[PDB]
Write an enzyme that holds these catalytic residues in place. Structure first.
Site, PDB file in Angstrom:
ATOM      1  N   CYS A 135      42.118  -5.634  44.129  1.00  0.00           N
ATOM      2  CA  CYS A 135      42.992  -6.561  44.102  1.00  0.00           C
ATOM      3  C   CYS A 135      41.968  -7.887  44.357  1.00  0.00           C
ATOM      4  O   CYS A 135      41.669  -8.771  43.906  1.00  0.00           O
ATOM      5  CB  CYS A 135      44.315  -6.102  44.648  1.00  0.00           C
ATOM      6  SG  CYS A 135      45.358  -7.454  44.806  1.00  0.00           S
ATOM      7  N   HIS A 191      45.633  -0.812  43.757  1.00  0.00           N
ATOM      8  CA  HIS A 191      45.211   0.094  44.770  1.00  0.00           C
ATOM      9  C   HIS A 191      44.979   1.506  44.886  1.00  0.00           C
ATOM     10  O   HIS A 191      46.133   2.201  44.917  1.00  0.00           O
ATOM     11  CB  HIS A 191      46.581  -0.315  45.811  1.00  0.00           C
ATOM     12  CG  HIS A 191      46.131  -2.091  46.272  1.00  0.00           C
ATOM     13  ND1 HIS A 191      45.965  -2.246  47.414  1.00  0.00           N
ATOM     14  CD2 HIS A 191      47.293  -2.771  45.555  1.00  0.00           C
ATOM     15  CE1 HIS A 191      46.526  -3.818  47.175  1.00  0.00           C
ATOM     16  NE2 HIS A 191      46.389  -4.224  46.317  1.00  0.00           N
ATOM     17  N   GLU A 230      43.624   3.956  47.046  1.00  0.00           N
ATOM     18  CA  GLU A 230      44.039   4.078  48.197  1.00  0.00           C
ATOM     19  C   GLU A 230      44.967   5.082  48.683  1.00  0.00           C
ATOM     20  O   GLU A 230      45.324   5.958  49.198  1.00  0.00           O
ATOM     21  CB  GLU A 230      43.840   2.863  49.741  1.00  0.00           C
ATOM     22  CG  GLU A 230      44.363   1.973  49.482  1.00  0.00           C
ATOM     23  CD  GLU A 230      44.476   0.798  48.756  1.00  0.00           C
ATOM     24  OE1 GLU A 230      43.408   0.967  47.594  1.00  0.00           O
ATOM     25  OE2 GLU A 230      44.934  -0.120  48.477  1.00  0.00           O
TER      26      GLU A 230
END
Ligand SMILES: Nc1ccn([C@@H]2O[C@H](COP(=O)(O)OP(=O)(O)OP(=O)(O)O)[C@@H](O)[C@H]2O)c(=O)n1
Ligand SMILES: Nc1ccn([C@@H]2O[C@H](COP(=O)(O)OP(=O)(O)OP(=O)(O)O)[C@@H](O)[C@H]2O)c(=O)n1
Ligand SMILES: Nc1ccn([C@@H]2O[C@H](COP(=O)(O)OP(=O)(O)OP(=O)(O)O)[C@@H](O)[C@H]2O)c(=O)n1
Ligand SMILES: Nc1ccn([C@@H]2O[C@H](COP(=O)(O)OP(=O)(O)OP(=O)(O)O)[C@@H](O)[C@H]2O)c(=O)n1
Lengths: 535, 535, 534
Positions: B379, B506, B508
């Site tokens: 990001c 994202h 993760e």
């Protein structure tokens, strides 16, 4: 000077009369020359009583600024001269609605909004806003101590006591001291457990107001005084009374105001309760008595017409007339007929919403007008009078209000947006609060108010259709008052009748026991004249 | 079948790891073939964690449907296969906001809205909505039992237990059993007072999860078992562990799942924790180790990068590489210089908002690209990479993002509404949730994902300016992924570098310990190759 | 002079160390010239600790007047000069025993005896009785706030606070502030709930003593300070320490004594803790180290020898010797043999009751006398020394005590009413409290005390049989101390030995860290010299 605060709470039960006690104490302190005010904290989730039904919460009191508040503010204005506003009554829903709006706006700067301190900070900010500027501020916490709903209110006022100090804060706790027949004595144990509830949340009572169906003996007050670590003079007995206007005298007889003035170091003369003694004098010595029928739709809860019932008693004080108020369901008039309206010296139709029972009120207005019975219509009671006159005099078949019959031919009552005529032609938003009204000369209300202009409070949507008004006026109906620019009809009168007045505003919100109200005084006075004419 | 509920609460202290325990238990029940789900009840006034700062609440977890939730849902998705949504996490502010909207709309029909039952009804409706459709539902109540903020949550779930019955409801209470040096033994008294708190609100615990820095002896569990009127097998010891992936094995070793399946009359085979034993096996037997520097702006709270730190450990499990994560303040790079970035086998710049520390991230990206250090931007970490390449390669002086410098000459990163060029010419809304992304052939990520299309989750406003993109592409920068209609740049890569990938989404949020993530696996693998090349 | 009261309570957990904190605070106030005293209110039903077992409750402390009290009165006398008495420790059983006695006696005039006010008045009467005559009185309440066993104690002292007023009363609350590894910080939530319990019973704290395994940061104390509505000066951090003798200094450094002198309107000079600073310096800088074995029967609970273990450490302060105490089960010597007593610079046999493990103590005393190892026997430790000497030197077969073998031929230890001889001929009952003792000239204890007479405290029933004493004295044994009219043997010594003393009284009840004790100082000193010779 420094603003002092008296926090008022209650235990054991809920219907202790917390607001009546706070208002009565405020009348004593005001009688000593002090600038006093009151405010009410409600633990409901409703943003304001504007949505609550009358049969659930009671009447919707309207302040001058147009705020829809709890009816406890009617008690406040009937005891002290200070005028209530929007800042004298807020709810849990208002607090959360304000905090939620600040969070979404980002005023909390990405922090985590919690009950403590953010919710308690919001409560303290409002209590200070309505209080600062006065000498003594009475803060009434709704609910019973020990419940979930009032825990943020109690924790908030506890933080104010710490920050302000015990030289300018007092905790006054109302409790129930019930009588047991098998014991032959009142019982202090419920007070013991209730005060223990306050201690567990960090509040120590300074004054105990003991409520019971009889006076709490000095022996039982001594047990309460020792258990609470307060002086015996700080334990006051408040028995059940026949008139709430005697409560100011009862509290002063036990030195409640002297203890408060001492704790706050206020040097003021002794209270002069001459006006309350005069009110009790007039109520106890009437000359004649009358029976006034109140025909409405919320009779199942008499508190739905709190200020109206109280203003009728005020009209009797000024005329030395005892008033027996008879609640009559307007829907019973629809089925059983006019036979239920016999034996009345006067008829009053109060306000309301919804078509249910309206046709019974229209029939009631026709009965009072044709039989020359003193009539007083308020808001909805004025609409049913206009509907009755347009139908049975102006020959407007099925004349009604668009609130009840939208596609009626003669919409004599409608929103300003809906104004039409019988042919359908047109011309080329809740009203709340005080508004000036211009009275017409040679009218009955022009003489009662003895003034060209008056100020009353509104709460309505539908108005008199000015397109169909001139035809009703040609049939004999009289316009007694107009307001604003659009010349909206505020008061109507029916000549060739002993007393027939109908108004759009709510005059009961400005009536007090010490000053009465010109409209209710003339209405009750005309009721006794009708009763005497039945020799 | 009939849905069963396991209410999870905690006492004594707040940081007991309630969500970790609920997620670990849900992994056992799922391993027995049961359809399990979890949900989290937060007592904050915020409507959602979307406004909370990362340094206060932690990371803002994003579900598939685009909901901004508490980070405890990241624990849920990393333990069970069930996908979280908006209905798996609500707050007190959400409840009040929903009830307030219904009241103003008039859905309560003029009634008085109260905490009981209206607030508790709103809570039960949401717990049922997220639960019904599963066999076992775990409901985690935030806060510590005995506080004001969680009282509506506890009273609501108490009413569900009565209505549903004890054959389909269980109360699991986490408590602290602290060790005292002067006593040489753990202490059960805090549990005694905490369980007494639950009894005073109408809740009897069925299972006690004892938290302590050491195993709670069977003798001390027996005292807890008798004081709580629960079987000794219902008192579980949960000591501090080095790896949370061992907690599923600890609970099964004490028969916690067998007691729950028995109470619910569920006939299912024994749990097969082979996948968790394999995860512990890989973590305990690494081959080499590396050091990865995470350069961000919320380092003061390591929980601000919860899923990122956890996904890095997942990349090490698949490569048998021990990862030493070094948090480096990007603002220290601004003042002290690049000297702090020495000794790193890889560099990761995570997401964030605000210009503070961004120039330190732009300098960090330039350092990794010029010195051939494996780099992974997410990001904001992708924006600083695009800014670095446009400035120091494409010769776009002072190229920046309109979020930080609105009137910059080269707005390489800006809102779609702001897209302009260096001359000012133009062409002829938070993205949240999962979106499909098309990978470009012959790119590094096309081989890592081994698929033409992928699905990742977004949380950003500012995009790559397509008006200035082709000039950066002529300077050597590579576009590896696009999405949607507007062909928004999702992934960029720098060729002639061992490993340099930056993505807008994202990744993760989709990484788990049992399955890893293709991007983090290749990133950690490239870090060990860089470390080995330093012979 | 209006007597002030400082009520001390504790929450969250029980093992907070309320007594040590009260004694440490009392040591500061006394260091400023104030007359202070301490009290202990136990919520047990036992009338007094005299019936409680040593291996379950700890040592039985004996005051001067002969009262059997809780061991916390041992901490009290080791911190302040004021002597404890029966008025400084009472239990719930004592309160109910008093009230029930007044009831049958008719002192209540046929009234209904109730918890409030009759039980609570009995508590307030005893708190005032032990308190009046002093400037500051520290009253420690046993148990944990929130439990029902101490509710009468808490309501009684709450009533005293109202009658006396906040100008002469203080509420000091000890609470646990635990550390969480998953949070990296200490937690104030248990203090919040414990203080709310205090408010539920009408008590508002004035001082918060935060106990933790580490110092409570100033940020967390400020959070506790405003939650409890107390000044930040009134929230004190008391982390875990390695020596209780540092606690008086830690509380003074945070200004706890100044806040109390201010609240009570007391004008007194600054505290002079020079003696306590000397105790800390001696403990932190030993020169040599010894190992003293304590061979007894109550080693299952170390608190059973509380004052003995503490007096041994005081003997090392006076000699700059680090004393490493090794508790040895005497019953193990019976089975495993003398080999357990190897590697000891000195041997101490403490007191006790019951034949179990005594034969191991008799074997231990013989090992010290024959191998010239320093020995100190206390009460029962003296009996086994006399029994060993009568058997293996005086040749009295199976010489024993009538407590263990009633019909032994040589009852060298017996009740005074039981005194006989080996032929059966006769001549022509607890001892508690302080009694004067006469020391024999040219003896070891005569030198150490440097006085002809001493005063020590007793707790025993069986004496030395004076009918068989002369035979043991002829065999070499020497009597060093006698008491009273019956010339009861109090101290015995074995010549031709480096240091062999045994006494009937309990000298550990007189030892303090600031003054030590002549017997223990000489005992540990002999252990250091024995260690150098090896
Ligand atoms: N543990 C509880 C129980 C109920 N409530 C609140 O209590 C209020 C009810 O007040 P009350 O007027 O006294 O009604 P009842 O509970 O029915 O009491 P009673 O029967 O005496 O009229 C409700 O608004 C509800 O929110 C609460 O806060 N805590
Ligand atoms: N916190 C308290 C206070 C009082 N008591 C007990 O309550 C009893 C009093 O019984 P009761 O007849 O209820 O006395 P009152 O409190 O005077 O009752 P009431 O005034 O309501 O008639 C006493 O024996 C006293 O021990 C108690 O246990 N807990
Ligand atoms: N509701 C209760 C329960 C227990 N007790 C008292 O608490 C005491 C126990 O003291 P403690 O040393 O704290 O025992 P534990 O509860 O076992 O303490 P812990 O397990 O934490 O070490 C007992 O004397 C008992 O009378 C009490 O008064 N109130
Ligand atoms: N009587 C109280 C006191 C506080 N709160 C709530 O308790 C929360 C604080 O929780 P916690 O994380 O435990 O913070 P601390 O109170 O500071 O606890 P600790 O010192 O152990 O971290 C706040 O959201 C506040 O709304 C509450 O509900 N009831």
């Amino acid at each position: 000077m420094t603003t002092n605060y008296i926090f008022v709470t209650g235990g054991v039960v809920s219907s202790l009369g917390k607001g009546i006690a706070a208002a009565s104490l405020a009348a004593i302190l005001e009688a000593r020359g002090l600038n006093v005010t009151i405010m009410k904290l409600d633990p409901y989730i409703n943003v304001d009583p504007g949505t609550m039904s009358p049969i659930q919460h009671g009447e919707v009191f309207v302040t001058e600024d147009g705020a829809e508040t709890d009816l406890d503010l009617g008690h406040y204005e009937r005891f002290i001269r200070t005028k209530m506003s929007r800042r004298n009554n807020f709810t849990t829903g208002r607090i959360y609605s304000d905090v939620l709006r600040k969070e979404r706006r980002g005023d909390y700067l990405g922090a985590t909004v919690q009950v403590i301190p953010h919710i308690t900070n919001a409560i303290k900010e409002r209590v200070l806003e309505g209080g600062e500027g006065h000498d003594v501020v009475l803060v009434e916490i709704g609910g019973t101590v020990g419940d979930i709903e009032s825990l943020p209110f109690l924790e908030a006022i506890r933080q104010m006591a710490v920050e302000i100090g015990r030289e300018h804060t007092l905790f006054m706790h109302l409790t129930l001291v019930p009588y047991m027949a098998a014991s032959g004595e009142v019982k202090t144990k419920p007070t013991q457990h209730s005060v223990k509830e306050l201690l567990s949340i960090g509040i120590q009572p300074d004054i105990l107001i003991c409520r019971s169906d009889r006076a709490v003996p000095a022996n039982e007050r001594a047990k309460i005084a020792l258990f609470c670590n307060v002086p015996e003079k700080a334990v006051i007995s408040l028995k059940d009374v026949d008139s709430i206007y005697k409560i100011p005298g009862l509290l002063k007889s036990q030195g409640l105001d002297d203890y408060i003035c001492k704790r706050f170091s206020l040097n003021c003369p002794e209270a002069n309760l001459s006006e309350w003694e005069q009110v009790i004098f007039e109520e106890a010595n009437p000359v004649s008595e009358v029976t006034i029928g109140m025909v409405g739709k919320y009779i199942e809860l008499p508190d739905a017409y709190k200020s109206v019932i109280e203003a009728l008693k005020h009209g009797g004080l000024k005329n030395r007339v005892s008033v027996n108020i008879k609640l009559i369901d307007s829907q019973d008039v629809e089925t059983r007929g006019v036979e239920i309206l016999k034996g009345l010296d006067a008829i009053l139709v109060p306000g309301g919403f919804g078509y249910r029972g309206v046709e019974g009120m229209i029939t009631t207005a026709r009965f009072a007008r044709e039989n020359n019975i003193p009539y007083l219509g308020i808001c909805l009671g004025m609409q049913v009078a206009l509907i009755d006159y347009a139908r049975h005099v102006a020959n407007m078949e099925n004349a009604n209000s668009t609130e009840f019959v939208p596609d009626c031919k003669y919409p004599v009552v409608a929103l300003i947006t809906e104004w039409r005529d019988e042919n359908g032609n047109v011309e080329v938003t809740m009203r709340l609060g005080a508004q000036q009204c211009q009275l017409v000369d040679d009218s009955l209300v022009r003489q009662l108010y003895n003034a060209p202009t008056i100020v009353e409070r509104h709460r309505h949507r539908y108005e008199v259709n000015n397109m169909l008004l001139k035809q009703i006026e040609d049939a004999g109906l009289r316009v007694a008052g107009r307001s604003g620019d659009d010349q909206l009809v505020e008061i109507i009168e029916v000549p060739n009748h002993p007393w027939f007045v109908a108004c759009q505003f709510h005059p009961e919100f400005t009536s007090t026991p010490r000053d009465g109200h010109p409209l209710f005084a003339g209405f009750v006075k005309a009721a006794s004249e009708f009763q005497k004419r039945q020799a």
